[PDB]
Design a protein around this ligand. Sequence first.
Ligand SMILES: [K+]
Lengths: 104, 154, 85, 307
Amino acid sequence: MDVFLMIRRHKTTIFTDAKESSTVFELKRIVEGILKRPPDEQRLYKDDQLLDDGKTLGECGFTSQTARPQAPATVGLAFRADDTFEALCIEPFSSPPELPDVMK
Amino acid sequence: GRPRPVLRSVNSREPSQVIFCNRSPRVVLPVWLNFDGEPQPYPTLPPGTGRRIHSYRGHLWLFRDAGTHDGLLVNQTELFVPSLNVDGQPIFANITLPVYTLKERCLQVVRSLVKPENYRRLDIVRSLYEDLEDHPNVQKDLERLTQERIAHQR
Amino acid sequence: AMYVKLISSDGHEFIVKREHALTSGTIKAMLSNEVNFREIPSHVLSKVCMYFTYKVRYTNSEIPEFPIAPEIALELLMAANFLDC
Amino acid sequence: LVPRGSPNYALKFTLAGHTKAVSSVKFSPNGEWLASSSADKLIKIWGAYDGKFEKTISGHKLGISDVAWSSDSNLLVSASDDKTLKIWDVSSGKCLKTLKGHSNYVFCCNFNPQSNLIVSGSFDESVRIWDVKTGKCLKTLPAHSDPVSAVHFNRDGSLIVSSSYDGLCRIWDTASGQCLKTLIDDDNPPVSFVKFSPNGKYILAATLDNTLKLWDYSKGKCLKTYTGHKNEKYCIFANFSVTGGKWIVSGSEDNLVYIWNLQTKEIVQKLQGHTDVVISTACHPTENIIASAALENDKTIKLWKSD
Ligand SMILES: [K+]
């Protein structure tokens, strides 16, 4: 089935979809189309965990049950330039205010 | 030379076997429009359930959230009219959620959290008060459906 | 395959398909390639982007509910109203 | 060329005791009384000649659709939306038996001439034959596939005729309960009323296309048609009048009683006065007296008399 993703670096979030059968490499070829950085300059994470180019999205844990259009899964992105590796850093979204009295 | 309400069952007296299939997350209210165009509430269906029921050729149904009266679809459209069963097979009425606008979906949720008395307490633009108070109902939908019908013919 | 950048009030950038974003007539007018919102924060605008995705997928498809927690409901109503989606 | 025959029915009394629609009026065989049934769940008994209220009979829990007398005029049977018939002692007003068995409204009822049997018809599409003495159901006939509008015995009780919204009249062998004959027209509109003729050789049937027909049912032969009234919705009774001239009588949805010549089929009188549908009419057994009864916007019984 289809999986729905948020690719996140710093204060940028990319909305994209893919297949469970798609590879991490194929996913990076997607990000390249958008950010113009080749796959070999990209590092993708699920949480703290680096993803192998050869593995499929389903193999990494990205299922259709957990990567839904209305609640997409997050993929960490950090760049690399030869022997220099950028730290993975994803800035949190803002918080909602306290729930108003008339909803309590 | 009086018209009859356009949205009504035809009094066929010809039995038709139907399966109401709730493929929505809502409790479904089936509504039958009688021969005089007056809506009649039928027993509800919990979500994920299906039920074989007895109706008639040319009768007219619609389906609403039994709690809020939100409109549902049936076989991807708003109304359902049984025909005669062919070769001993029931007719399926697949009831699903529409793809609501985000606005209507938001209105559904706020309405579920705030009593109508309190809508104008909310710190939002005045026009949203009118939207919150504009509860979905069958009367309105009958009107809308007739209007769309008349547009299509003309 | 065309993409646009929607920027929340707190400076978060959301890169989404143009087609998905054009669900909002407001966004369509603001495009006429980036759009800055002055009052829509990142938690709310990410949620709206999730709606765009949900809308496009499940139009012409069994359809699930679009979930909305109580805590975001009012701000999301305001944004939905403003964006008219 | 002498003027055609024609009665001159003139209103004599209005009986305003019921508080809702009046469903049925019937003269007792002995001529003395009129019984009336109503949606107000009451039977009332009136003097046939003066329209003088005699008594109220109560006990049904919903509306009553029909009443009928026993041959000796001592018993009444009622048919109710509460899914029962009741057999009443006419002297004491007492309910002798409740006939329980129909699974929906009971619309119509009649004693056989001998009056040891009651026949009933229901919305449940069945026809039932009951034992008067014990109140036990003897037969349940799978009569019809739609609500049953009328049930009548013939002159010796050997036949029953039933009419249905399924567009059929059916003739039943009383003893076996088997159907001897059905008459299906091409135009199969709901059959709203039926009864055998005095001689037992014919059936008079109403359909809800504003038609009364006289059938010779053994020949499958429509002998006469009677039209000009309005009857598309309610199940309106019809009568053979035999005390004077030979007439057909029926109510109508235009609030009139219609009287036709039986042989020529011409209308010879319309009786005006009611302010709603006239659902029931009755003819007195010995005198030229008609009773008529109307629905909710009238709620009255009228007594009409002729030379
Ligand atoms: K039924």
